[PDB]
Every structure is written in C-alpha cells, then in structure tokens.
Symmetry: C2
C-alpha cells in the first residue's frame, strides 16, 4: 500500500506528504514517517480519516 | 492493498476487522467501513496508528 498524508492549516494552506510508511498519533501529536528516512511531527493534530481506495490519510485538529 | 483494523480492549481481548475500505474518527468514535457494505462504530476510540507495510490500522482509547 502507498499512502499520502494530507492536512489543511488554519489559514487554508494545504500540505501533502507522500511516500508514507507509518502515521502514529501519540503524545498530542501526529508523527509521519516516510520512505526517505524522514519523520514529520505535527503537534495538536489527530488522524481523521484513512481511505484505502485513494491511499489518503487525512489529519485533523485533535 | 489490503487493510485491517485492530483494537485491544481493556481486558486484553483483541478485535480485528478485515477488508477495510474507510476508517474515520468523528464525534468521539471511530467508524470502520468494509468492502462488504458493513459499517462498525467504536465509541470512545481514536485512530492510533497506520502502518503501510503491514496494512494495519490500530485503534486506541481516546
């Protein structure tokens, strides 16, 4: 399975991160690990939706 | 891609749901839709982890 994470900021800015390996919600943040051995951490967010057709994982405010 | 949902109860009991299409966290619950037009609601849970290698989506107590 190939997945991307999407989120929208309070200002309407949208961020998408591809080549996702793992998404974990812990300690008040969402951590996104990718295939390039990088992690992106988003404090105050939760995992809102996982859509297996599209491969999209949507983040939301916790 | 195949995904399954997994959750562990307070007593150590595990539940697994296969053939998952969509997982959504809203209104204090997680809703799991499957490929056979079945939907399962889990109140009090959140989406804790999404693991793209294994295809496992883990639910946790909110």
């Amino acid at each position: 399975c190939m997945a991307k994470v999407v989120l929208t900021k309070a200002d309407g800015g949208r961020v998408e991160i591809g080549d996702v390996l793992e998404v974990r919600a812990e300690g008040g943040a969402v951590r996104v690990t990718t295939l390039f051995d990088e992690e992106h951490a988003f404090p105050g967010l939760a995992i809102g939706r996982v859509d297996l057709r599209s491969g999209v994982i949507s983040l939301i405010e916790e």
